[PDB]
């Protein structure tokens, strides 16, 4: 869209279109947390790391998806290489969660929530893992559905990774605390 001519309403139309498409996924993450409230009430430090866990999940997403798309749009990876990039993105997801969680557990300890150390340590690895895999098989699934991945991957992997970052962090919290 050409910018300097458009008025506030002209901008607002397109911008609210996309932002209201994303506020629905915001709604579903809110509903997931409301469902898991039973552990947030038990310990209130859990909420202290939802932003960092989501900004690592839906970031490993928008990074692996970009990496796969820019290598799938130069014919470096054919679309039939999902099972060969799978056993590579799983490995890099492990080798990257084991350091992102290594830094975040240091942060949690410096905060002083020893009951949070195990849950954060397991959860950041299990979010980076199942966000890297879902950010790497999002472009293949999109291009196999018939849609250009670079178009509708940037928001889609962010939503599909923050939902499944909450749904993993809170589940690990319920398994490790109550």
């Amino acid at each position, epitope marked *: 869209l050409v910018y300097s001519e458009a008025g506030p309403v002209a901008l607002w139309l397109a911008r609210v279109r996309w932002l209201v498409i994303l506020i629905l996924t915001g709604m579903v993450t809110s509903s997931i947390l409301q469902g898991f409230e039973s552990v947030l009430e038990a310990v209130t430090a859990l909420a202290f790391y939802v932003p960092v866990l989501l900004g690592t999940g839906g970031n490993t997403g928008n990074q692996s998806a970009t990496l796969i798309i820019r290598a799938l749009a130069t014919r470096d990876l054919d679309l039939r290489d999902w*099972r060969r990039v799978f056993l590579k993105e799983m490995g890099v997801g492990l080798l990257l969660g084991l350091t992102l969680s290594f830094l975040l557990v240091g942060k949690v300890y410096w905060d002083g929530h020893p009951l949070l150390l195990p849950v954060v340590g397991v959860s950041l690895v299990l979010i980076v893992f199942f966000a890297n895999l879902v950010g790497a098989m999002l472009p293949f699934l999109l*291009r196999r*559905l*018939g849609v250009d991945p670079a178009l509708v991957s940037n928001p889609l992997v962010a939503t599909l990774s923050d939902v499944t970052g909450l749904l993993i962090y809170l589940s690990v919290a319920r398994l490790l605390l109550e």
Partner: antibody
Amino acid sequence: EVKLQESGVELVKPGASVKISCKASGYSFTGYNMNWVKQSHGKSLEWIGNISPYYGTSIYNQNFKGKATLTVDRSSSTAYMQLNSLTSEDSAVYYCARGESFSNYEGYYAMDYWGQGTSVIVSS
Amino acid sequence: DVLMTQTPLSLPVSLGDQASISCRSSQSLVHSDGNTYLHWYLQKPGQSPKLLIYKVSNRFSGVPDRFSGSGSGTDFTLKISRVEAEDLGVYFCSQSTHVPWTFGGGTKLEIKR
């Protein structure tokens, strides 16, 4: 079914640069990758490029990297091969063949439908 | 890449018999995805090679049931039930796993006069 029609007979001088045209018809040219394959003077084939129309980029045979350049035009629905510095060994017939879906909703993955042949002859 | 090949190069058969075309790869053409890309093309004399057998088990559309493609691993084979007069030509067995997707040497289909 699908008719894949390309340019006619071709004649060139050694060291020239010929641009073989392959127009698509009967299918959405944006969503199927065109494969360029050359047949020598009564011999086996040799796959010499796979142009992806939607992205406009291509993957190339090792023996033909540089000796060939694939470009397309989505609106024109034509697949273009541009031979470069074509020596006497390039005196062959050059097929274009639609051969891989963009959605990969085809199963197989090589050579759905082929052109008709653009005899490329190098000589004085 | 895979310096693929066919045997024999000439196949003297009759009209109404069974003809078996071997196709022996150089290295195994099983993909990381994992299915046997050993496509078979028939190039009728003075035409363009149209696809006959894909993913050696399967068959293409518009293809009469006379053609039978089987085998797996590195050794693949296309067999005819009854050689008809519309099936003569040269038979290319290609691959699609390892770039470049090389083609076979191709074998003709003569008549055993």
